[PDB]
A and B are shown apart, each in its own frame.
Chain A
Amino acid sequence: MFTVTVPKDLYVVEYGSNMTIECKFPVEKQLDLAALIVYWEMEDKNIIQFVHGEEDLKVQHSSYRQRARLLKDQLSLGNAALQITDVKLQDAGVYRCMISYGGADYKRITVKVNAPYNKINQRILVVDPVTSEHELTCQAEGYPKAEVIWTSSDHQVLSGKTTTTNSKREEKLFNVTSTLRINTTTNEIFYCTFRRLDENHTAELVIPELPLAHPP
């Protein structure tokens, strides 16, 4: 038989990365580019439709527009590699490559998307300069859900209040917020650790000088 080979059937991919997923098919001498047909699909979405040595863009699902390319140089070496730019959680799923070249076969590939809380926004506001009470806030987005552990500079656990909402900036991604209210002094250090539930990303918060530009 003419058989499409897949060197791996499972890709774990990092949110926002580029992935290349490979279908291997036999090519002996120079390939008849005309004869070659390559389809890539994820579930019901068409990604790549390569026929008569060209792509039909008119048939590609919009969610794969500008971000999906067949590597045409690879085609000569029996390689139907699909590259997807800026991978999101919606790109997780089962991919099929379909090749017709002296016969016709398909293979399934599973893509999983890992979305870590690796990016942490922080904010330190004084609540009352007299008590020296401050509000420390860390936020990050990821999947799945995360707890936030607040630690002192001596790595003792402090109690904060966490708020988990569905991201508005993207989809399926959780937006996690924790704030620590504590009486503290300039140059004291705090850590907030995002710990996914079911990896540990830590930010350093340094207490700044009390601002002198403040109303009564």
Chain B
Amino acid sequence: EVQLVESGGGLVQAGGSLRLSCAASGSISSRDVMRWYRQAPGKQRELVASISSGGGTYYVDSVKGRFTISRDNAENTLYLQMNSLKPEDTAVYYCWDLGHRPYFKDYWGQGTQVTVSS
């Protein structure tokens, strides 16, 4: 079993920037794939960014060139660098992890609110 604790959310104005952090404690691994999802209010949860064990990345079209997902395996930390924030970036951001070590399972954070003022 694994815990994900997201942090860094808050109030930023459009064109601004911030780093989200997710601290992963428990049965983690550099072989686990990790992700950032977000849910705008009464919209559907969407995939933002994805990082494989091999450090290979996918980004949803609306954040390509603005957001960067990276991992620090030593510190069990996942990062999202968000540049050139837009009001539609406003959402709860959730950290996500696909565990394989004990069993095959995915884990969710509780999320961190990002608010982009115009």
Contacts and interface: CB of A to CB of B under 8 A. Distances in A.
B107 to A, nearest CB: 10
Q: Is the interface of A mostly helix, strand, loop or mixed?
A: strand
Interface in A16-53: 32, 34-35, 37, 39, 51-52
B47 interface: yes
Given A37-B98, A51-B33, A56 B106 contact: no
Contacts of A98: 100, 104
A96 B100 CA distance: 12
Nearest to B106: A104
B104 A52 contact: no
Contacts of A54: 56
Given A52-B58, A104-B104, 20 more contacts: A34-B47, A34-B58, A39-B104, A51-B33, A51-B50, A51-B56, A52-B50, A52-B52, A52-B56, A54-B56, A56-B52, A56-B56, A58-B54, A59-B53, A59-B54, A98-B104, A100-B98, A104-B98, A105-B104, A106-B103
State which size class the interface on A falls in.
10 to 19
Interface of A: 32, 34-35, 37, 39, 51-52, 54, 56, 58-59, 96, 98, 100, 103-106
A5 to B, nearest CB: 15
Contact of B50 (A34, A58, A96, A106): A34
